[PDB]
Design a protein around this nucleic acid. Structure first.
Lengths: 241, 365, 114, 185, 90
RNA sequence: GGUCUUAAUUGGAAUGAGUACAAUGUAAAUACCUUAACGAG
């Protein structure tokens, strides 16, 4: 712990170790182990002993499936649904670059956006796309290309619409100095020149750009701040709780 | 909590029904009112506990019950006050009424039977009880003494909650409202402090800033304060104060200065201004009231901006020493406490038109 | 004046609490005769005024500072009494916790007399 | 591999160990204040020297200097809160001329004398060190306390101790029970 | 007689409970002997002592005051289900 | 020469250092804070 990712905001003292994300759908540095979510962000748990006690009750689903692992690696666009409590979150960034506590409606919880990472011909001649959350869906629309994004159902897998990556799309920044900024595009030099709803301009690597809809028309609810906050998010959670 | 009540333009004012009632005993200390039938409670420098009902606005208050003292309690917790009870208030549920005074003993009473329910000794040589305030809707109890100490008691636990220290001068006056906090004024200190009880925090206010300011202000074209007399806390976030020099100061947590100030409220008589004897408000409203031996009830309105106040009007109905003021509605009927001699004994000259008892006032709308 | 009156009344109050004060025209006179008065305070609205007119004379002869405050009611309250006081004497105590405050008042009074 | 506990010493002994003139001066002080040894004076001679230094430096800066202003006013305000610097001699030029008595005068020690409560700086000590004295709600048994201004009034015997209500003492209480066991029955 | 205040009362249905801050005033007594807080904090709710648990007590210096952390469950079987055991022996 | 001006005698009238029931503290203990019975010539 100290060699953990800063954006979990674990204190310095407390112990020597941090959770260390299980293997899963999101790379370790880019994830949010449930334990940190239950106890550290949401305050439902105190102990790690109690995080577990919660999870074994099957009180928590990620993307619709009950997940029962303390250090399960949840991440960007993931849903997380605590039922006996009626809450639906979606893990999406602060403008600081912190997984924000962001309650979403009881619908919306029903879909997520995934970035396509690869699009390839699997065997038997069947094609597949691979999203950033490590989903593979076969038989996708032939128009879907690498870097496009894709509305997944969630109860069934199933892509149910997509967005191309081209000049003028609305965009989430998923890493680096600009991690959390949202904005239109402008230009792909790979680097992507982004302009936000304030005519503030900035670049990042193509790797860090995530397409989330059309200008002024995100396909998901944005956190307080419109990536121009995870703190505001935490202020509402504990206070209503 | 704040002011949602604006009737300030409604009031029956001039036509207010005014009347008096002569009473048996002398030098009436204080008056309280329980509102769920209406109830009336006064204790006397004559060593008596006295109980009436006003619950009709058509008629004068009407006798209920009394219990009188003597010397016969003299010794250390004995059931009764052989000395003068200097303040009174009753349990906000109406289940109890409590008293303290020169003998620095707490005698709380079951109202209905009107016989001692319990007694707690204050334990000091200096512990005389100057004032009493309940929190709303609670048997939490705030109490002030001249040892600079503040005492808190939850009635049904009949137990000593908490204690506070800290005014350089004696503590005359405390006000309290629904949320938990209360205010005290240190008289000759020229300061007043606020108390968040569990947090156990005090916040500080300083008035008294000299003349030769008024003069210097007004020469582009008259009194110091000796002491802070009283305080009535209007909302959570604002309140009013008064001082022997006849300055009324609304103070607000927004600044460390007074947010507004007024001079010679009840007038003067080189020369002597009137003290501001009784300062009282009705919760979360735009209106408060003061009274003094100059005998003109002065009812003031808050302006909706809450950045200044104005006179609504005057009720001559009272004359002489004004100890307390209480507003009870169902309409309004104000009950005034008038003795011929001030509470704490430094005497006020040649009271005439003097009397002792309740003063009645009937306003509506 | 107003300022000096408040300064005086506050010191009188502290002197009362520390029992370093004598109240009344007669008691004041005696402190002067004994040379134990730091300064004399008198009420300007004393009625009749004649009952205390010997004090200014006595103070001048003893080189003791004296001054009048406007209200006997106020001076009475400062003395910690529920009655009006027309004369008061702050007594000597070189080890007094309020010696400096007493000296400050003396200096103010002395300046007025000059 | 821990984190140093920082400490410093609080007094300073004088250069010339045998000046009759300084020795007498110190004894007078011990006597008039009910002091215990020299370190009890030495500590204050030391407190003072740093204040005066602090002052001196500041005074060499330009008046209207943010440093001077910010810290000068603070030193003064601090010095006044404790009743060391008179309600006005409120300038750096005056703190320089402040002297030891001016501090020595605000010890709990000397205050518990200064308002009756004791009638002796020595009764005072033993009273303080024996719990019978609260400042506010709080017992204070350090003679060296340093009574701040608007705290002057709150000093009084404690809710525990014979002299503040609550029992008498265990030597009195012993005496009540010798007139009891023999002379009673 | 004690004065008992519970601040910060939040509902945690995840563990089927109320979480709060214990604040007990000890004006002359000495201390509290936490069993009796299971008593009073039992009867102040419907709790029948073995469904509450109070541990987090460090007293106020100078005395007379105690501040800690306290738990109220429904369903004393859940107190047998969820509690750490070294208080179940307490 | 100058200059100022007490006891190898007795009498009776609170407190923790310690010590120690308790409870408190603690993971268990210990000390601190609280506190019965004790504890000054």
């Amino acid at each position: 712990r100290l060699a953990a990712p800063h954006h979990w905001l674990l204190d310095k003292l407390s112990g020597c170790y941090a959770p260390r994300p299980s293997a899963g759908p999101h790379k370790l540095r880019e994830s949010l182990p449930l334990i940190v979510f239950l106890r550290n962000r949401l305050k439902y748990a105190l102990n790690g002993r109690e995080v577990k006690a919660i999870l074994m009750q099957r009180h928590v689903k990620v993307d619709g499936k009950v997940r029962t692992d303390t250090t399960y690696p949840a991440g960007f666009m993931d849903v997380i649904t605590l039922d006996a409590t009626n809450e639906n979150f979606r893990l999406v960034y602060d403008v600081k670059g912190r997984f924000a506590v962001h309650r979403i409606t009881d619908e919306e919880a029903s879909y997520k956006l995934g970035k396509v990472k690869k699009v390839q011909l699997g065997k038997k001649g069947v094609p597949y796309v691979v999203t950033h959350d490590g989903r593979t869906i076969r038989y996708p629309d032939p128009n879907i290309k690498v870097n496009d994004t894709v509305k997944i159902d969630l109860a069934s897998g199933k892509i149910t619409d997509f967005i191309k990556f081209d000049a003028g799309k609305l965009v989430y920044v998923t890493g680096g100095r600009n991690l959390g900024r949202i904005g239109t595009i402008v230009h792909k030099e790979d680097l992507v020149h982004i302009k936000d709803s304030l005519d503030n301009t900035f670049v990042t690597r193509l790797n860090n750009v995530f397409v989330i809809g059309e200008q002024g028309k995100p396909y998901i609810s944005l956190p307080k701040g419109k990536g121009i906050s995870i703190a505001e998010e935490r202020d509402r959670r504990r206070a209503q709780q | 909590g704040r002011v949602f009540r604006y009737f300030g333009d409604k009031l029956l004012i001039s036509e207010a029904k005014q009347s008096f009632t002569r009473v048996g005993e002398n030098n009436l200390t204080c008056i309280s009112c329980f509102q769920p039938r209406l109830f009336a409670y006064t204790v006397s420098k004559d060593l008596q506990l006295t109980k009436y009902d006003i619950t009709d606005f058509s008629k004068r208050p009407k006798k209920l019950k009394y219990a009188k003292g003597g010397a016969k309690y003299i010794p250390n917790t004995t059931e009764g006050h052989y000395d003068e009870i200097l303040t009174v208030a009753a349990s906000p549920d109406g289940k109890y009424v409590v008293t303290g005074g020169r003998d620095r003993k707490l005698i709380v009473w079951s109202t209905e039977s009107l016989s001692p329910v319990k007694v707690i000794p204050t334990k000091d040589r200096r512990g005389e009880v100057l004032s009493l305030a309940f929190r709303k809707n609670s048997d939490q109890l705030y109490a002030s003494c001249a040892d600079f100490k503040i005492r808190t008691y939850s009635i049904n636990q009949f137990s000593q909650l908490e204690i506070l220290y800290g005014h350089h001068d004696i503590v005359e006056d405390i006000s309290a409202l629904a949320m938990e906090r209360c205010v005290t004024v240190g008289a000759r200190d020229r300061t007043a402090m606020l108390w968040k009880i569990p947090d156990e925090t005090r916040l500080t206010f300083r008035g008294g800033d000299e003349p030769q300011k008024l003069l210097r202000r007004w020469m582009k074209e008259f009194f110091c304060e000796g002491s802070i007399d009283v305080v009535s806390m209007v909302d959570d976030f604002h309140f009013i104060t008064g001082s022997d020099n006849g300055n009324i100061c609304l103070w607000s947590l927004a600044k460390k200065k007074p947010i507004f100030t007024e001079r010679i409220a009840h007038g003067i008589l080189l020369l002597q201004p009137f003290w501001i004897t009784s300062l009282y408000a009705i919760p979360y409203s735009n209106v408060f009231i003061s009274g003094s031996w100059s005998g003109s009830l002065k009812v003031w309105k808050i302006s909706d901006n809450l950045r200044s106040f104005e006179l609504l009007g005057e009720l001559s109905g009272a004359k002489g020493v004004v100890t307390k003021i209480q507003v009870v509605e169902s309409k309004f009927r104000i009950l005034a406490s008038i003795a011929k001699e001030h509470r704490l004994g430094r005497w006020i000259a040649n009271v005439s038109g003097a009397r002792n008892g309740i003063y009645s006032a009937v306003i509506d709308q | 004046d107003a300022a000096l009156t408040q300064q005086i009344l506050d010191v009188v109050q502290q002197a009362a609490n520390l029992r370093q004060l004598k109240k009344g025209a007669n008691e004041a006179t005696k402190t002067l005769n004994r040379g134990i008065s730091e300064f004399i305070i008198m009420a300007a609205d004393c009625e009749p005024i004649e009952i205390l007119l010997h004090l200014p004379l006595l103070c001048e002869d003893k080189n003791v500072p004296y001054v009048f405050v406007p209200s006997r009611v106020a001076l009475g309250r400062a003395c910690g009494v529920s009655r009006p006081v027309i004369a008061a004497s702050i007594t000597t105590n070189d080890a007094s916790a309020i010696k400096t405050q007493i000296y400050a008042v003396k200096d103010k009074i002395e300046t007025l007399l000059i | 591999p821990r984190a140093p506990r920082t400490y410093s010493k609080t007094y300073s002994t004088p250069k010339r160990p045998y000046e009759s003139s300084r020795l007498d001066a110190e004894l007078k002080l011990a006597g008039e204040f009910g002091l215990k040894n020299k370190k009890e004076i030495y500590r204050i001679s030391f407190q003072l020297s740093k204040i005066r230094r602090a002052a001196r430096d500041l005074l060499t800066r330009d008046e209207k200097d943010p440093k001077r202003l910010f810290e000068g006013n603070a030193l003064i305000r601090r010095l006044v809160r404790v009743g060391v610097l008179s309600e006005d001699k409120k300038k750096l030029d005056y703190v320089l001329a402040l002297k030891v008595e001016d501090f020595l005068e605000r010890r709990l020690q000397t205050q518990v004398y200064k308002l009756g409560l004791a009638k002796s700086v020595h009764h005072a000590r033993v009273l303080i060190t024996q719990r019978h004295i609260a400042v506010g709600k709080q017992i204070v048994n350090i003679p060296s306390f340093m009574v701040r201004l608007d705290s002057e009034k709150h000093i009084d015997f404690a809710p525990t101790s014979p002299f503040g209500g609550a029992r008498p003492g265990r030597v009195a209480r012993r005496n009540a029970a010798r007139k009891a066991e023999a002379s009673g029955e | 007689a004690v004065t008992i205040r519970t601040r910060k009362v939040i509902s945690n249905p995840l563990l089927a409970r109320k979480q709060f801050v214990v604040d007990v005033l000890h004006p002359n007594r000495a201390n509290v002997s936490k069993d009796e807080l299971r008593e009073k904090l039992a009867e102040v709710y419907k709790a029948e002592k073995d469904a509450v648990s109070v541990f987090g007590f460090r007293t106020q210096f100078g005395g007379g005051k105690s501040v800690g952390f306290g738990l109220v469950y429904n369903s004393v079987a859940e107190a047998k289900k969820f509690e750490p055991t070294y208080r179940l022996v307490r």
